[PDB]
Amino acid sequence: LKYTCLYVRSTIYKRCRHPGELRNGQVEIKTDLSFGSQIEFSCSEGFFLIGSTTSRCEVVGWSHPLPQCE
Amino acid sequence: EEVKKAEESESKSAAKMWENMYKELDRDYSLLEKTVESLENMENLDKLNKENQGKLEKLELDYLKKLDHEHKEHQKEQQEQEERQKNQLE
Amino acid sequence: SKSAAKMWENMYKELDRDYSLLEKTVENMSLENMENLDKLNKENQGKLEKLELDYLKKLDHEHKEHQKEQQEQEER
Ligand SMILES: [Ca+2]
Ligand SMILES: [Ca+2]
Ligand SMILES: [Ca+2]
Ligand SMILES: [Ca+2]
Ligand SMILES: [Ca+2]
């Protein structure tokens, strides 16, 4: 029986690209940058987060883009 | 006392290091994730099978033409020898 | 910062390990495709020889048939 990857793999988890750097903010990596993992966003003191607070590596790419602080 | 300032300075530069070489390898890893898929090999084996079968078909047809050509000349040579014994006038 | 440096080190070491796994996966796949193409051409060349063998054996059989044909015509 010959199976196929649903994930990426000659007879593992897919990986999302680097999320970038959130200016006047912080990007928290909970686990890794692979498929299924999620990241969290926070802004600095006196900054409002305009956009999503989290983002997941969905089927691969980031579910939500980079938010903004002011 | 001044050691704590050196540990945080070393940890900060190390954090900016392991993150930076990750960014470089993450870009190169994307090129390796794409070259994995597969279709180039399935198309290579399928393309060679077509050219190889075109060789087996062109050669068999050429041999079948020569075999049919030999039989044609034999049937004509025997008919010529028959018309010669009939003329051989006594 | 110490926890940030250990996370990016552990994430690179996994990125480095998975890269070596993908490199060996493509290297073995590329070698197996070359071996499959070699068996395809080797199995092919065996079929060309079978066509030539049958062509020569049939052509040789036709020469012998024409010999027995004339010998049977001379006796009859
Ligand atoms: Ca960062
Ligand atoms: Ca605020
Ligand atoms: Ca390949
Ligand atoms: Ca030949
Ligand atoms: Ca007979």
XYZ file of C-alpha atoms and ligand atoms in Angstrom:
241
model
C 0.000 0.000 0.000
C 1.348 3.396 -1.104
C 0.131 6.336 0.989
C 0.563 10.078 0.455
C 1.220 13.091 2.661
C -1.918 15.044 3.562
C 2.428 17.933 6.228
C 5.372 17.284 3.898
C 7.812 14.403 3.470
C 11.326 8.517 0.233
C 9.058 5.492 0.679
C 6.750 15.430 8.913
C 5.078 18.725 9.790
C 5.006 21.485 7.209
C 6.626 24.742 8.306
C 5.443 28.343 8.105
C 7.855 31.117 7.201
C 9.250 33.585 9.711
C 6.444 35.865 10.979
C 8.627 38.980 10.960
C 9.162 41.631 13.609
C 6.257 43.591 15.105
C 7.361 47.220 15.386
C 6.678 48.614 18.874
C 5.506 45.123 19.826
C 6.465 41.524 20.601
C 5.914 38.230 18.767
C 5.632 35.285 21.165
C 6.355 31.823 19.745
C 4.530 29.200 21.813
C 5.884 26.007 20.238
C 7.621 26.056 16.832
C 6.921 27.616 13.414
C 5.436 24.400 12.003
C 1.903 23.512 10.922
C -0.652 23.610 13.736
C 1.376 25.876 16.022
C 0.257 29.386 16.955
C 1.886 32.705 17.840
C 0.715 35.609 19.991
C 1.064 39.364 19.500
C 1.445 42.166 22.039
C 2.049 45.898 21.739
C 4.246 48.119 23.888
C 3.033 50.398 26.676
C 0.570 52.975 25.389
C 0.039 51.111 22.098
C -3.254 49.665 20.853
C -3.166 46.402 18.904
C -4.914 46.952 15.556
C -5.502 43.511 14.061
C -5.442 39.906 15.195
C -3.993 38.923 18.566
C -2.992 35.407 17.451
C -2.084 33.601 14.240
C -1.945 29.918 13.313
C -0.045 28.008 10.626
C -3.065 26.836 8.635
C -3.295 24.718 5.493
C 0.661 26.312 4.478
C 0.497 29.909 5.672
C -0.256 32.215 8.562
C -3.978 32.508 9.271
C -3.683 36.156 10.320
C -1.168 38.788 9.155
C 0.991 41.086 11.259
C -1.056 43.409 13.510
C -0.181 47.057 14.129
C 0.577 49.214 17.168
C -0.604 52.799 16.573
C 28.217 42.545 40.173
C 29.137 43.612 36.642
C 28.827 39.960 35.570
C 25.028 40.199 35.397
C 25.419 42.994 32.842
C 27.701 40.703 30.825
C 25.330 37.720 30.953
C 22.360 39.735 29.679
C 24.580 41.281 27.000
C 25.807 37.851 25.886
C 22.295 36.381 25.995
C 20.925 39.262 23.911
C 23.588 38.884 21.216
C 23.116 35.106 21.256
C 19.354 35.562 20.868
C 19.968 37.892 17.917
C 22.324 35.238 16.515
C 20.260 32.037 16.643
C 17.316 34.049 15.287
C 19.328 35.497 12.398
C 20.765 32.207 11.120
C 17.268 30.767 11.457
C 16.003 33.427 9.038
C 18.710 32.476 6.535
C 18.080 28.736 6.873
C 14.301 29.243 6.826
C 14.646 30.869 3.398
C 16.861 28.037 2.135
C 14.554 25.426 3.689
C 11.700 26.777 1.558
C 13.733 26.004 -1.569
C 14.279 22.446 -0.316
C 10.600 22.041 0.589
C 9.609 22.910 -2.997
C 12.185 20.754 -4.804
C 10.908 17.676 -2.938
C 7.714 17.649 -5.017
C 8.241 14.004 -7.495
C 6.449 15.219 -10.618
C 9.756 15.723 -12.441
C 10.603 12.047 -11.878
C 7.135 10.761 -12.811
C 7.291 12.830 -15.995
C 10.862 11.713 -16.724
C 9.953 8.020 -16.536
C 6.809 8.659 -18.591
C 8.730 10.606 -21.246
C 11.361 7.874 -21.605
C 8.683 5.184 -21.935
C 7.164 6.995 -24.922
C 10.472 7.432 -26.758
C 11.451 3.818 -26.062
C 8.119 2.562 -27.409
C 8.539 4.694 -30.524
C 11.800 2.828 -31.095
C 10.223 -0.614 -30.665
C 7.399 0.308 -33.051
C 9.595 1.858 -35.750
C 11.985 -1.108 -35.661
C 9.231 -3.738 -35.755
C 7.533 -1.983 -38.677
C 10.869 -1.817 -40.505
C 11.430 -5.543 -39.948
C 7.860 -6.355 -40.994
C 8.384 -4.338 -44.184
C 11.603 -6.198 -45.026
C 10.018 -9.579 -44.275
C 7.100 -8.668 -46.547
C 9.560 -7.330 -49.133
C 11.478 -10.622 -49.202
C 8.293 -12.658 -49.656
C 7.197 -10.378 -52.506
C 10.444 -10.841 -54.438
C 10.322 -14.604 -53.835
C 6.779 -14.869 -55.201
C 7.861 -12.800 -58.214
C 11.065 -14.773 -58.841
C 9.175 -18.077 -58.766
C 6.638 -16.648 -61.223
C 9.504 -15.576 -63.493
C 11.103 -19.031 -63.386
C 7.705 -20.523 -64.252
C 7.338 -18.254 -67.293
C 10.871 -19.264 -68.316
C 10.298 -23.028 -68.226
C 7.084 -22.499 -70.204
C 8.983 -20.671 -72.950
C 11.730 -23.318 -72.861
C 10.637 -23.539 -77.744
C 10.972 -27.307 -78.151
C 16.941 36.947 27.025
C 18.504 33.652 28.092
C 15.209 31.872 27.416
C 14.940 33.684 24.074
C 18.407 32.528 23.007
C 17.709 28.904 23.952
C 14.424 28.884 22.019
C 15.987 30.172 18.810
C 18.887 27.748 19.246
C 16.492 24.817 19.667
C 14.410 26.007 16.705
C 17.458 26.320 14.465
C 18.787 22.907 15.523
C 15.444 21.430 14.459
C 15.454 23.485 11.244
C 18.989 22.217 10.620
C 18.021 18.599 11.317
C 14.899 18.684 9.135
C 16.946 20.254 6.329
C 19.318 17.281 6.431
C 16.327 14.924 6.322
C 14.895 16.693 3.269
C 18.330 16.696 1.613
C 18.724 12.936 2.062
C 15.112 12.436 0.955
C 15.763 14.199 -2.357
C 19.166 12.516 -2.743
C 17.680 9.030 -2.372
C 14.733 9.940 -4.621
C 17.085 11.262 -7.296
C 19.234 8.121 -7.115
C 16.214 5.803 -7.256
C 14.924 7.621 -10.346
C 18.270 7.119 -12.106
C 18.168 3.430 -11.205
C 14.599 3.170 -12.502
C 15.621 4.806 -15.787
C 18.596 2.442 -16.075
C 16.308 -0.573 -15.661
C 13.927 0.921 -18.233
C 16.700 1.278 -20.816
C 18.128 -2.141 -19.927
C 14.696 -3.748 -20.276
C 14.314 -1.825 -23.543
C 17.600 -2.972 -25.104
C 16.514 -6.529 -24.329
C 13.404 -5.933 -26.441
C 15.352 -4.508 -29.391
C 17.495 -7.656 -29.360
C 14.362 -9.824 -29.317
C 13.078 -8.026 -32.420
C 16.386 -8.516 -34.239
C 16.607 -12.159 -33.141
C 13.100 -12.890 -34.426
C 13.813 -10.977 -37.644
C 17.002 -12.942 -38.324
C 15.440 -16.264 -37.302
C 12.472 -15.634 -39.606
C 14.718 -14.472 -42.455
C 16.895 -17.560 -41.970
C 13.776 -19.742 -41.880
C 12.608 -18.246 -45.182
C 15.934 -19.099 -46.836
C 15.589 -22.740 -45.780
C 11.966 -22.876 -46.954
C 12.995 -21.775 -50.452
C 15.617 -24.543 -50.541
C 13.111 -27.275 -49.665
C 10.693 -25.674 -52.142
C 12.971 -26.100 -55.161
C 14.086 -29.572 -54.062
C 10.431 -30.632 -53.847
C 9.732 -29.105 -57.271
C 12.659 -30.890 -58.936
C 11.546 -34.274 -57.587
C 7.897 -33.723 -58.549
Ca 12.169 38.371 16.509
Ca -2.561 51.047 25.884
Ca 13.350 15.231 -6.945
Ca 18.769 -2.673 -33.996
Ca 5.908 -27.378 -46.968
